């Protein structure tokens, strides 16, 4: 969801983990707090059963 | 369970072991049915817990990577339904053999054209990113046709090209100890090409010498023979040295004088070989030579030319009586 | 065919190992979707980069193209690409926290089993044998190109708006996720088809370079206006299958 320089070696790369926690909340902003928030909340696609 | 993209290593016939490894590491072998010779190295997993070795999954992946005249060439990666063989393109001589083998003979215009593939070898994987980090006569192959090809990539990694930035942590243990640059065994994390160099002048001194010239028994030790022959390690011939933690904190003589090309006079003799030797025998990584300039030295183009590997060959005998038996009546 | 190796005509996506199965098409399609969302969810728990996540996702897509979601559950295989990805991608992860992640993902309500444990030592064994199978499936083709890379390199060429640069991103990350576009083609058309949409939402047109090229021909040369609009369609057609789409 946000742009990495690709020029980076591998090692380099920040890791993905989500600056704050992921809530629960369904809000335009919410459902795009991260690839998480936005493919389960926004999408409604889910692993679980 | 389908499998089309690792055949099994039954494709292949064992011939025989390639060396004193373990029970079955290296084999070599033939394609039954185009009887390509082939060298097949098992992945070794006796340490089992972070699954296939981060190890083997970067020398696949430089292997793979790497496609050069000088450098082994990996065919492909079998199985046996459990081991997984990664597949070689075999080389009948490792330099670490030839050169223990006093009975064969180097022209100096051989020894020319064996640095001079080893070199381009490594300009080749510098040039894609990748510090070789084993070197040492043993990984340096050489086939019956007489072309080299720097081998065994099981301790390689990518490195980054910056000049920019930040600075990058590499594993510091690594390089067999009597091939080890200095900056190494002082500690250093952000290392580059250079440690390979080195390791090729190391190699270049044993074309002539015929065994290690740095033989160090420990870390220690091995910083000792350095100062004894390239001399002490100071601020004076290596800027900021001096910053090293290890610095301090370890035995260095301080009254060493480099003495590389004294030593080596007996033995080497040609001037221009001398000069690369000690150009790649330089303390300070920034100043050691790299594999483009040391491909353009004097020695690479100066009489004797670089010649093939035929006469050095032919000296390579089949048996006893070969080697020990005059040449007459 | 060794570069063509891992790309498949519309007709062999179709003729799927799942579908061999009785899977059906859109069933498949979601099992995917599912597992990208699982690799995605462990991935930045275990905060591996962007490029790992991306990675795992690309194996789990070629993985499914030779085996069968019936008989390996995409929830299985999932943690052992990812486990693979962070290796290969530089920035490994114990095989124990990767074990923990998943279990939280897969279990949220019952508790990690005792690491001593048969049955923990069992899974411990099971995700380093699927690796195995993992690796073996895929011949041991580790590299990945992914379309992000393409796509900075473009958005930083026509000089995009920060936003314009970002939703290209986040499309790319889509692509990964929701579509088998990485199956079908290369990275830099990919690429494109990411730019192309998000210069639609932002109705915004990339000026054509003096008296020649348009803008995605600076990233490959093979692509067409016509294959844009068409992919651009058909990954519309897809976000509009999904789920949820039908403080
Ligand atoms: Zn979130
Ligand atoms: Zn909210």
Redesign the interface.
């Known amino acids: 969801?946000?742009?990495?320089?690709?020029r980076l070696?591998?090692?380099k790369?920040?890791?993905?983990?989500?600056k704050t926690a992921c809530?629960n909340?369904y809000?335009k902003?919410?459902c795009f707090h991260?690839?998480?928030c936005f493919?389960?909340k926004?999408?409604?696609?889910?692993?679980?059963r | 369970?389908?499998?089309?993209?690792?055949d099994e290593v039954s494709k292949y016939e064992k011939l025989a072991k390639i060396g004193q490894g373990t029970f079955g590491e290296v084999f070599k072998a033939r394609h039954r049915k185009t009887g390509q010779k082939v060298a097949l190295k098992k992945v070794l997993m006796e340490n089992?817990?972070?699954?296939?070795p981060?190890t083997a999954?970067r020398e696949?992946?430089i292997l793979?990577?790497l496609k050069h005249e000088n450098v082994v060439n990996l065919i492909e990666?079998c199985?046996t339904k459990?081991s997984?063989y990664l597949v070689f393109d075999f080389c009948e001589h490792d330099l670490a053999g030839l050169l223990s083998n006093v009975l064969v003979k180097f022209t100096l215009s051989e020894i020319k054209r064996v640095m001079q593939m080893l070199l381009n070898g490594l300009y080749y994987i510098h040039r894609n990113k990748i510090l070789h980090r084993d070197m040492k006569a043993a990984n340096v192959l050489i086939t019956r046709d007489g072309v080299l090809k720097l081998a065994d990539f099981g301790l390689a990694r990518?490195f980054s090209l910056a000049k920019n930035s930040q600075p990058n942590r590499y594993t510091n243990r690594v390089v067999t100890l009597w091939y080890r640059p200095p900056e190494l065994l002082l500690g250093e994390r952000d290392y580059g090409p250079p440690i390979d160099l080195w390791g090729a002048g190391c190699i270049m001194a044993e074309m002539w010498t015929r065994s290690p010239i740095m033989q160090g028994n420990t870390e220690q030790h091995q910083l000792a023979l350095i100062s004894q022959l390239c001399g002490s390690i100071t601020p004076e011939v290596w800027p900021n040295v001096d910053n090293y933690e290890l610095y301090e904190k370890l035995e260095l003589v301080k009254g060493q004088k480099r003495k590389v090309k004294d030593r080596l006079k007996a033995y080497v003799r040609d001037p221009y070989a001398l000069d690369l030797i000690d150009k790649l025998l330089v303390l300070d990584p920034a100043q050691r030579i790299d594999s483009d300039d040391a491909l353009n030295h004097d020695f690479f183009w100066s009489d004797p030319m670089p010649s093939d590997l035929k006469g050095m060959l032919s000296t390579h005998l089949t048996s006893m009586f070969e080697y020990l038996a005059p040449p007459r009546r | 065919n060794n570069n063509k190796?891992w790309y498949f005509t519309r007709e062999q996506l179709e003729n799927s190992?799942s579908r061999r199965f009785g899977v059906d098409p859109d069933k498949e399609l979601?099992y995917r979707?599912?597992?990208?969302?699982?690799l995605?969810?462990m991935?930045?728990?275990?905060?591996?980069?962007?490029?790992?996540?991306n990675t795992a996702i690309v194996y789990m897509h070629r993985f499914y193209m030779?085996?069968s979601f019936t008989?390996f559950p995409?929830?299985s295989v999932?943690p052992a690409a990812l486990?693979?990805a962070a290796?290969?991608?530089?920035?490994?992860k114990?095989?124990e926290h990767v074990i923990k992640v998943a279990h939280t993902?897969?279990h949220p309500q019952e508790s990690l089993p005792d690491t001593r444990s048969e049955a923990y030592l069992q899974q411990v064994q099971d995700?380093?044998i699927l690796?195995?199978?993992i690796?073996?499936?895929?011949?041991?083709?580790?590299?990945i190109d992914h379309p992000?890379?393409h796509?900075?390199?473009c958005?930083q060429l026509v000089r995009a708006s920060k936003d314009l640069?970002?939703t290209s991103?986040?499309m790319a990350?889509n692509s990964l996720?929701?579509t088998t576009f990485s199956l079908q083609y290369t990275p830099p058309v990919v690429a494109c088809v990411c730019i192309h949409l998000a210069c639609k939402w932002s109705n915004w047109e990339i000026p054509v370079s003096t008296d020649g090229k348009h803008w995605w021909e600076y990233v490959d040369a093979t692509v067409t206006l016509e294959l844009l609009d068409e992919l651009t369609h058909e990954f519309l057609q897809i976000?509009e299958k999904?789920?949820?789409?039908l403080?």
């Open positions: 969801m946000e742009p990495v320089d690709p070696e591998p090692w790369h920040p890791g993905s983990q989500p809530t909340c809000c902003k919410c991260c690839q998480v493919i389960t926004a999408l409604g696609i889910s692993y679980g | 369970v389908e499998c089309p993209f690792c089992e817990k972070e699954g296939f981060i999954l696949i992946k793979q990577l990666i199985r459990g997984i990518a | 190796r190992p979601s979707q599912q597992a990208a969302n699982l995605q969810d991935g930045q728990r275990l905060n591996v980069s962007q490029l790992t996540i030779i085996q008989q995409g929830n999932a486990f693979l290796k290969v991608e530089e920035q490994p114990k095989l993902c897969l995700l380093v690796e195995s199978i690796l073996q499936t895929l011949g041991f083709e580790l590299t992000h890379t796509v900075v390199k958005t640069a970002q991103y986040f990350t996720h929701l976000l999904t789920p949820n789409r403080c």
